[PDB]
Write a protein that binds this ligand. Structure first.
Ligand SMILES: Cn1c(=O)c2cc(C(=O)NCCCN3CCCCCC3)sc2c2ccccc21
Ligand SMILES: Cn1c(=O)c2cc(C(=O)NCCCN3CCCCCC3)sc2c2ccccc21
Lengths: 333, 333
């Protein structure tokens, strides 16, 4: 897995493109420092699951030469940069404090929101910059860039839903230039997760690996895989929420524990949940409500069932390497 | 000029793509309302100079059929959406209040910064979505998307410079995770303007028009034009600053009046300028300093000289239609 070592080779390259700009040497030095810091800060320290998935899938769908490895590692790090851009955007939107156990990029003294927005856009453009640099001549250049386009669009729509579903505008169907009860249900939650997480996290890396491996687009796999991605997305996102509840409640996010507590709890407890926001007492009240009906074991049951369904789908893929890769990913948990 | 009427045909199309997503009808209705509002709010009300430039240049480099008009209007509105995304990003970054004589998109009750970031990214992706929808089969699809890539990258770098040049980090050349005197000069100002404004505002539309007209990329025009764009950018950006000073001072932006006042004023007045921020008294002090040395007439002299140089470059283009279009643009002022 010679993936991390390639990082510099790509990052520097992008900065080199900015170095070639018509600027004075001093400005060049300062911007190179700043953008190197940005990349090393927001694209490092994570598990890099997406890029590793890309690499594994490409290897298993294929004895691979150096140019292929370079292209694949570029794609993996491009997806990692997409993750970083989404992560910084979410830190800005959700008013988060710590990401990867360090201060959010927009919270730094030298980087306010003003810099954070511009930097997220820089990262998003750098993705396609590197893709153009390394894969324009490859037969799947348009397929890859359009896969990134669609994954980003669906993630953006999912983030919008995750942010604004309980807002006043989403209630009662015009806009004027609080929990919405009808909005909390498993169908809306599935929509939010699938668009928000499933595609960019799972579908996009798998599709990139398959396309680089030589699988034709019209192959039926690209739909089966999609379904699997959806399921996996669902699975992991629920897991994520399970980790959060053990600041979704603070930001009034529609979460799996909320929906299941609402389903299980009585009407007075539904009213109590509705009444409970940036206040510790309300958060602990909702945590106690969750712990009363023991939603933490319902998550275990859901994990079992969803993993069963995912494995059933994987066995229906009928492709040895991709099946092994996805089974390994699920075994990671 | 059948440009505005096409707007809906493109906007709806993009929303239709989002409608095709796997969502419930209610969520579909709400998101369609919200994104239609976003597009109609941030992409309408302006002069639409960039798109009109695209259309005029394409027409003059060419008796044009319907598919060509559709593609060209799509490109023009894509550049307008790029303008809107940059405009909303700048409103977020500079903490502005009114844009196009109405509340900034991020200031609305139903749209905070959280929604504004996601919406700017949505608009940026919608640009390439429409480009793919309308021009993927055209021979210049990659050229156009890469032109957009580079224009956006240079605009992002220019915005970063315009925002952070006077910051502490830019002084003395590492980052720790006030006016910088050495930074204010005509060379740094030229860099900031050229990257920030010249390319996306002028070079990008001209290049799109020429490429759609059938001009080969390796033609020498694509460099002469670049120079002209630079000059024009410079010109107009200075004009823009002249309009602002008649909130650049509030946000501590490096502006043409600041540099020229520093050049003309004595050392005590340089210290006074440095000492003067979100305070009315300081702003009026700097305005009085500007009005003392009458920088408002130095702007007139600069306008004359820069227009002369731009016209000299245009006469050196040696292309009738593009020369006429650029002369008309300069006559707009
Ligand atoms: C391949 N692989 C993965 O792809 C994946 C994804 C995961 C996740 O929890 N994602 C939620 C993040 C929500 N963001 C949405 C974007 C918009 C804003 C940011 C917020 S865990 C995970 C994983 C775990 C172990 C092994 C492999 C894995
Ligand atoms: C074709 N045409 C133009 O292209 C143009 C551009 C103009 C301008 O003042 N731009 C500054 C805007 C700075 N933004 C930078 C992006 C990053 C953040 C936003 C801030 S005026 C103008 C113009 C005027 C009359 C006729 C034609 C024209």
């Amino acid at each position: 897995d010679y993936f991390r070592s390639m990082y510099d080779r790509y990052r520097d390259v992008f900065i080199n493109h900015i170095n070639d700009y018509v600027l004075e040497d001093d400005i060049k030095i300062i911007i190179s420092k700043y953008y190197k810091l940005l990349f090393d800060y927001n694209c490092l320290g994570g598990k890099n699951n997406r890029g590793i998935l890309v690499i594994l899938i490409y290897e298993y769908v294929k004895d691979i030469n150096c140019n292929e490895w370079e292209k694949v590692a570029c794609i993996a790090w491009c997806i990692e940069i997409l993750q970083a851009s989404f992560l910084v955007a979410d830190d800005i939107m959700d008013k988060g404090e710590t990401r990867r156990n360090k201060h959010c990029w927009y919270l730094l003294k030298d980087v306010e929101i003003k810099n954070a927005v511009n930097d997220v856009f820089l990262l998003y453009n750098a993705i396609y910059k590197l893709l153009d640099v390394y894969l324009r001549n490859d037969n799947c250049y348009l397929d890859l860039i359009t896969s990134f386009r669609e994954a980003t669009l669906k993630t953006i729509v999912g983030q919008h839903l995750d942010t604004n579903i309980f807002s006043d505008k989403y209630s009662h169907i015009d806009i004027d230039v609080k929990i919405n009860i009808n909005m909390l249900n498993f169908k809306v939650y599935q929509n939010i997760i699938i668009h928000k997480t499933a595609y960019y996290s799972f579908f996009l890396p798998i599709v990139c690996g398959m396309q680089m491996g030589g699988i034709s687009l019209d192959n039926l796999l690209y739909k089966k895989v999609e379904n699997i991605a959806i399921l996996m997305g669902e699975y992991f996102q629920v897991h994520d929420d399970y980790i959060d509840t053990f600041s979704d409640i603070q930001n009034n996010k529609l979460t799996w524990p909320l929906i299941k507590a609402f389903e299980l709890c009585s009407q007075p407890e539904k009213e109590d949940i509705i009444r409970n926001k940036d206040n510790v007492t309300c958060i602990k009240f909702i945590n106690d409500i969750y712990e009363h009906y023991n939603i933490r074991d319902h998550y275990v049951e859901y994990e079992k069932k969803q993993k069963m369904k995912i494995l059933e789908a994987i066995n229906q893929l009928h492709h040895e390497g991709i099946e092994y890769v996805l089974k390994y990913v699920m075994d990671i948990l």
